[model samples]
Target: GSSGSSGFKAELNEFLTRELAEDGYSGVEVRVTPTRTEIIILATRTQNVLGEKGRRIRELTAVVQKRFGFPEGSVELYAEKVATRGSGPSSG
Candidate 1:
């Protein structure tokens, strides 16, 4: 039961937090279904992901597929919403 949630990687998050998601991608969401390891990227500038005619985003998905040990036809994306980590009053 616990194997599904093991292998925590703060390093992975740190890289995504500091580098990959630098410009517009403010957050990353991971979804693990029986046969899928979905990596949903949240950002204000969705264009950064959906590059040109989605060439960039497809590459990202391929990375996920290769990294997550997926054979093929697994891992996908979801456009959740614009990211907002505010220094505003309500954020406190």
Candidate 2:
């Protein structure tokens, strides 16, 4: 009956989806453990999301914490590059 945590995660995913949609964001993975919470962002161009000075992600953490009520300093965010997904013709 741990719907609370699952609910939080669902909302978190939805929030990220809309916020980073323009950043070539593909999806988000949420890993929760005893010690920490990890959020991996999959995107074609991670730099677009990270931005200069790393302020984009920093502010994201703050909003996630404030909006989602994830404990202070308990969430860690990481950006991962995903393979370009598209259809192509075969070559001989």
Candidate 3:
């Protein structure tokens, strides 16, 4: 079942990338347990995906509910800003 779950998670990531990539989406992480699902979205601009007054988030919630079949309120979604790009060592 773990493999199946991982495949589904990959599918979900692909969906988010297709839908939000234009909005500066950087990456996504999905954590699933028997009780809840946690989704973390990383982006260059968190507000773009979050939308005005969190309307977009609500829509995203609906998308997860309808498309992924997650129950209402069983999902915890988070958006994080990518503070730096290519900030590794050995470079200026």
Model 1 over residues 1-92: C-alpha lDDT tens digits?
22244452343345455544645766666767998666666677777667778877777667655555556666666545574576677765
Poorly placed runs, candidate 2 (over 4 Å): 1-5, 84-92
lDDT tens per residue, model 2, 1-92: 13345666677778989989888987777788898899888888888778887878888988888887778768898888887578676755
Overall lDDT per candidate, in order of appearance: 0.60, 0.81, 0.80
Give Cα distance to truth, residue 5, candidate 3, Å. Answer: 8.1
Judge candidate 2 at residue 5 and give its lDDT: 50
Clashing pairs in 2: none
Model 3 segments beyond 4 Å from truth?
1-5, 84-92
lDDT of 1 at 69: 55
Q: Give the winner by lDDT.
A: 2
Error of 1 at 59 (Å): 1.0
Which ranges in model 1 have alpha carbons more than 4 Å from their true place? 1-12, 18-22, 83-92
TM-score per candidate, in order?
A: 0.61, 0.77, 0.77
User: Cα miss at 30, model 2 (Å)?
Assistant: 1.1
